[PDB]
Amino acid sequence: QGEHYDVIILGTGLKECILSGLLSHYGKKILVLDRNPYYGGETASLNLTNLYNTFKPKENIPSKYGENRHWNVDLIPKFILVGGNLVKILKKTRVTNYLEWLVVEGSYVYQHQKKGFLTSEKFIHKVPATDMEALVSPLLSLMEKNRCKNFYQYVSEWDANKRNTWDNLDPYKLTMLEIYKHFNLCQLTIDFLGHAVALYLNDDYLKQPAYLTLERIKLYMQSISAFGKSPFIYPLYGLGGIPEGFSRMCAINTFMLNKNVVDFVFDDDNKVCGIKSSDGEIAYCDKVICDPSYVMHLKNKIKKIGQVIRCICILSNPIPETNQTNSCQIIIPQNQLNRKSDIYINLVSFQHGVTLKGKYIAIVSATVETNNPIKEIEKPLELLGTIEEKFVKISDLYVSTSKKPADNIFVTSSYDATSHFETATNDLLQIWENLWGQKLNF
């Protein structure tokens, strides 16, 4: 009798949209519903009116910021690694072409260098990604430069499946730390390699087999060649083209805003079999994918693991010491700020169609470790020069309580503090694997 779908998806956050795209691509019958009057959920894109309504509702919008059409401010701007899986997913689903991609102009890492007699105090530095960049890197002593050049040369020719490229270092038996020690790299070198090139969140990889990390370092290095300036891209007008893109694509094989779900329907074995709205709509389904906001009434679905702070800052000029770049990423390794998790800064501007020409947006993101998260981002904010306005959002971080829920309600994790997309893609890939029992193939 009633409407029936393979999967009903609740929320139009980026992960939900991407998963909807993949389901529609592989022939599944889906319905996508969102309580909000706009797409994007926690990853929504805001114009000026909406940025101000959301964060500064008592204030007039300054005239100097001009018209709404120039502003597309992602709440959660994550850059995308050229060689990563999101790009592969967008290719497969044929959504890539609804978007225009522009390279992020630079990649920086924080390493404090104290004022000397002939050298200024420094904080952030270009991340070297070729042998030649390493030999010339201010991150490395004269000597360490040669060593890092040798390391990059090695990785550049290294192959996980060709032993004659290993120089007798077994990457399945040796740990990454043993590989570093073979090249006699120092701790600060290890710091930026692990956090800013291999793009890890912590130093657990040091004790794991080397091949995992070599592949990632090689991937970073390969990813630059596409656009040269960095291995990261971001769409013109920001990540808001993505839900639009997927809505348009899925409609071929639909998405609905302003749809207020008020209940899950469960069968006799407590497995999801449908959803109901406040407007007396019902549909049946075999599975649900949703963000944590849709399961706040349900038992043992999500676990809070912490909070994230993001501070969106309007600047008058590029970030000092980033070579006047119109877009950039700054990775701050946790040991640099005496803390237990990294801090990240993304910068975007008129280049990516997200701000008025002459204005910039820097977004500082951190995992909350203290009673006073605003204080935790004080030093990072000092990197930005004159800040015109700040828009701060602190959010709870949830993860799902199991990878393969018996009830067939698959919950996406909250977006983490990272400035790039990998961990989001990893979560949606894990959800995909467990929906159908098979990894996505590229």
Domain with 212 in it: what CATH number?
A: 1.10.405.10
Q: Which of 231, 257, 286 is the last residue of a domain?
A: 231
Tell me how far the alpha carbon of residue 148 is from its chain's centroid.
27
Instruction: Please provide residue 159's backbone torsions phi and psi, each rounded to the nearest 5 degrees.
Output: -140, 125
Are 77 and 220 members of one domain? no
131 and 227 share one domain: yes
Helix pair angle (14-25, 85-92), 10° resolution: 40
Provide the pairing of β-strand 302-315 with 328-332: unpaired
What is the rounded distance in angstroms from the CA atom of residue 131 to the CA atom of residue 156?
9
Domain of residue 418 covers 1-56+232-305+398-442
Closest CA to 227 of 107, 133, 134, 135: 107
Does 311 share its domain with 382?
yes
DSSP state of 175: B
Q: Which technique? A: X-ray
Final residue of a structural domain among 231, 260, 278? 231
The closest alpha carbon to 216, from 242, 185, 194, belongs to 194
Q: Are residues 301 and 405 in the same domain?
A: yes
What CATH number corresponds to the domain at position 377?
3.30.519.10
CB 290 within 8 A of CB 16: yes
Cα atoms in the Cβ-side hemisphere of radius 13 Å centred on 102: 16
Chosen domain end from 190, 216, 231:
231
CA distance 409 to 267: 13
287 with 236, same domain: the answer is: yes
Count up the domains in the chain and report the number.
3
The two three-digit tokens of residue 204, written as one number: 């657990």
Question: Do 296 and 428 reside in the same domain of the chain?
Answer: yes
Say yes or no: 404 and 301 in one domain.
Answer: yes
For residues 127 and 220, the answer to whether their CB atoms sit within 8 Å is no
Same domain, 424 and 332: no
Domain identity same for 239 and 293: yes
* CA 23 from centre of chain: 22
My answer on whether 299 and 357 are in the same domain is no
Tokens found for residue 251: 């409609």
Sheet with 343-349, strands from edge to edge, namely 122-126, 106-113, 328-332, 343-349, 360-367, 302-315, 387-400
User: Distance between CA 237 and CA 253 in Å, rounded?
Assistant: 26
In one-letter notation, the amino acid at residue 416 is D
Could you tell me how many residues make up the chain? Answer: 442
Please give the sequence-ordered ranges of beta strands (E in DSSP) within 42-142, or none if there are none.
Answer: 45-46, 73-74, 80-81, 101-103, 106-113, 122-126
Q: Can you tell me the distance from the alpha carbon of 68 to that of 89, in angstroms, rounded to the nearest whole number?
A: 31
Residues 200 and 244 in one domain: no
Chain CA centroid to CA 200, Å? 12
CATH number at residue 426: 3.50.50.60
Closest by Cα among 323, 300, 308, 315 to 108: 323
**Are 132 and 147 within one domain?**
yes
Q: Give the number of other Cβ atoms within 10 Å of residue 36's Cβ.
A: 15
From CA 269, how far away is CA 284, in angstroms rounded? 15
In the beta sheet, which residues pair with residue 274? 265, 284
Rounded CA separation 205/140 (Å): 22
